[PDB]
Amino acid sequence: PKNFGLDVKITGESENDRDLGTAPGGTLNDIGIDLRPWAFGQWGDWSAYFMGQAVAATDTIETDTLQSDTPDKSYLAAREFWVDYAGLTAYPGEHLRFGRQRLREDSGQWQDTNIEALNWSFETTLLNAHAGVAQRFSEYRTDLDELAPEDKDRTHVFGDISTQWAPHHRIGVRIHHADDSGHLRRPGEEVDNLDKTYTGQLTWLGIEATGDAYNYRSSMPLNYWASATWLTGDRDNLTTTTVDDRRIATGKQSGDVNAFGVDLGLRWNIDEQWKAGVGYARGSGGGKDGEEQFQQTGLESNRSNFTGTRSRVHRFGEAFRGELSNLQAATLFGSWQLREDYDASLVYHKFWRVDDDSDIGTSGINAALQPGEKDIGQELDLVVTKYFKSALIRFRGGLFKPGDAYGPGTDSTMHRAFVDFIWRF
Numbered sequence: 001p002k003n004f005g006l007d008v009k010i011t012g013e014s015e016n017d018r019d020l021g022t023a024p025g026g027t028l029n030d031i032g033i034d035l036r037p038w039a040f041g042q043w044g045d046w047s048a049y050f051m052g053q054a055v056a057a058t059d060t061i062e063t064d065t066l067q068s069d070t071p072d073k074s075y076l077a078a079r080e081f082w083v084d085y086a087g088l089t090a091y092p093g094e095h096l097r098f099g100r101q102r103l104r105e106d107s108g109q110w111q112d113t114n115i116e117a118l119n120w121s122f123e124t125t126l127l128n129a130h131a132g133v134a135q136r137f138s139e140y141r142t143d144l145d146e147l148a149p150e151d152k153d154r155t156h157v158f159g160d161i162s163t164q165w166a167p168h169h170r171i172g173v174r175i176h177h178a179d180d181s182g183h184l185r186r187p188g189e190e191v192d193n194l195d196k197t198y199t200g201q202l203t204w205l206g207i208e209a210t211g212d213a214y215n216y217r218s219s220m221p222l223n224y225w226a227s228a229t230w231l232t233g234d235r236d237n238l239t240t241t242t243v244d245d246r247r248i249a250t251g252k253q254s255g256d257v258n259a260f261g262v263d264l265g266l267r268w269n270i271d272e273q274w275k276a277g278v279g280y281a282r283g284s285g286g287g288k289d290g291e292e293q294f295q296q297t298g299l300e301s302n303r304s305n306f307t308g309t310r311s312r313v314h315r316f317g318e319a320f321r322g323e324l325s326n327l328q329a330a331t332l333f334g335s336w337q338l339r340e341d342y343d344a345s346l347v348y349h350k351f352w353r354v355d356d357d358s359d360i361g362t363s364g365i366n367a368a369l370q371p372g373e374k375d376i377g378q379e380l381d382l383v384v385t386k387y388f389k390s391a392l393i394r395f396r397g398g399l400f401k402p403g404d405a406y407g408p409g410t411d412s413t414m415h416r417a418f419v420d421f422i423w424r425f
């Protein structure tokens, strides 16, 4: 029985320009402290949990590798607050959770965030199923009084069902729906940064096959992941006049969304220390008003253990932070690990634009794209970790080289590096 605990973290973030010299800001070389006290109790079928956050930094630096963690120098936050009930069935892996909680999916491409949700979890040796509802109402932070433009009035409903057909081999289907209840800006009106750009309903229907894809300790000399997703729905996009400094609303446009996302990967377990492999991912692009343009839920971190280590790496570069939106990416990787002691991960990515006249999903780059050019760029990552006997010291960095899609006047190279010192009580 463990009731209280505290997580002390010391983050060192260094990021360079983001907009690659096209706008003011995006540069960081700052240090910060993160104290996360957590409470927990359990009474029969019931259990309750709370986690707070206290952050004091030299600037607005990132303190965790989550979607809710993508403002003033210091802030207090209500990280997690939930009540759980495991008395619905006689199943040990079955439980219903209500409140702000972490929604986790192993690929991190669907859900990996702390959000207000009612999530029903069912886990057995043979079958795993999860069904829930989620919506953002507040950031529960002292420095933020307004939600993200995309999170405001966005209601989610998700379902997972997967079976272990062969030992270490899982096949499953996934469903997600995001409904936008928002209000768009009127022609003469002003459109802000925290102001909405789109409305409409989007349904995701995916199929995923795994053979110890995110399991660092496997008997199998080869590991794989294969995921195919079909995005269907409609959208109400606010057109703008970006040329004027204020960027006024003007009109809007409608278009049905019919897109598709694919993600393949192969890992080679050379021995119990050395691992390597290839990855490929494509998010459909083009069509009128982004008709064939794929997009993700908005609850994704795109972080996983695809490299074959305890450490979680960003699937589409730590610096570029790729999203499967009009994006095609080739991936090479290599990892090393000693005992429960150390681990390293070296990853290389080459990015492409599916449609040369439309935008790409980038969670780390804020630069305009050159029309008619598909070469986004190439990235190299390094994740190094030492574990303490229970903290860890970790370097997590990416080095992005902007290609032909980012015209002259943009930086030759950009980075995003982190040094994290955690100590859990």
Ligand SMILES: CCCCCCC/C=C/CCCCCC(=O)OC[C@@H](O)CO
Binding pocket: 166, 167, 169, 211
């Ligand atoms: C273009 C689509 C063609 C449809 C065929 C799909 C075939 C996909 C194969 C994926 C790699 C092989 C997986 C092998 C595997 O799961 O091991 C079976 C083993 O565990 C049984 O004991």
Ligand SMILES: CCCCCCC/C=C\CCCCCC(=O)OC[C@@H](O)CO
Binding pocket: 003, 039, 040, 041, 042, 048, 049, 050, 081, 082, 083, 098, 099, 100
């Ligand atoms: C939307 C639901 C939110 C629920 C709030 C989360 C609950 C807050 C803290 C979790 C720890 C349980 C606190 C209850 C308590 O103090 O009972 C005493 C007992 O735990 C002694 O250890």
Ligand SMILES: CCCCCCC/C=C\CCCCCC(=O)OC[C@@H](O)CO
Binding pocket: 120, 131, 132, 157, 158, 159, 160, 175, 176, 177, 203
């Ligand atoms: C006791 C366990 C609670 C589960 C209750 C069952 C909830 C109903 C359906 C579960 C499917 C997952 C939800 C996803 C969904 O249906 O939305 C997609 C739908 O809008 C397609 O247009």
Ligand SMILES: CCCCCCC/C=C\CCCCCC(=O)OC[C@@H](O)CO
Binding pocket: 014, 016, 380, 381, 382, 397, 398, 399, 413, 414, 415, 416, 417
């Ligand atoms: C063997 C190479 C492994 C790759 C290491 C990845 C580390 C990523 C970024 C390092 C940040 C420190 C700045 C280093 C530097 O001087 O880069 C110059 C220029 O590219 C700035 O973006």
Ligand SMILES: CCCCCCC/C=C\CCCCCC(=O)OC[C@H](O)CO
Binding pocket: 338, 342, 384, 385, 386, 393, 394, 395, 419
């Ligand atoms: C910015 C700090 C983040 C980096 C973590 C520090 C890890 C340092 C070196 C990793 C390379 C592995 C060498 C250590 C090793 O395995 O041999 C020594 C002993 O076996 C363990 O003490």
Ligand SMILES: CCCCCCCCCCCC[N+](C)(C)[O-]
Binding pocket: 012, 013, 014, 029, 030, 031, 058, 417, 418, 419
């Ligand atoms: C390699 C990644 C490590 C990031 C580097 C962190 C440097 C600490 C910056 C503190 C100095 C900033 N200042 C002047 C505002 O205090």
Ligand SMILES: CCCCCCCCCCCC[N+](C)(C)[O-]
Binding pocket: 033, 035, 054, 055, 056, 074, 075, 076, 142
């Ligand atoms: C060197 C700083 C001391 C480390 C302690 C970190 C906790 C900082 C709490 C900040 C909360 C204040 N705030 C933002 C609500 O006004």
Ligand SMILES: CCCCCCCCCCCC[N+](C)(C)[O-]
Binding pocket: 052, 053, 054, 076, 077, 078, 140, 141, 142, 143, 144, 145
């Ligand atoms: C360490 C946890 C401390 C408790 C939670 C503090 C967060 C309060 C959120 C309300 C902040 C007020 N505001 C400015 C957003 O309106």
Ligand SMILES: CCCCCCCCCCCC[N+](C)(C)[O-]
Binding pocket: 126, 163, 164, 165, 166, 171, 209
């Ligand atoms: C990518 C390989 C495709 C394999 C398809 C799965 C066939 C296994 C037969 C289903 C039986 C499932 N089970 C274990 C619940 O009985």
Ligand SMILES: CCCCCCCCCCCC[N+](C)(C)[O-]
Binding pocket: 268, 270, 276, 277, 278, 332, 333
């Ligand atoms: C990034 C490319 C993928 C790495 C491929 C892994 C290399 C295969 C292992 C060759 C080792 C030879 N051996 C021991 C089997 O004889």
Ligand SMILES: [Ca+2]
Binding pocket: 017, 018, 019, 020, 021, 022, 023, 024, 025, 026, 027
């Ligand atoms: Ca800049």
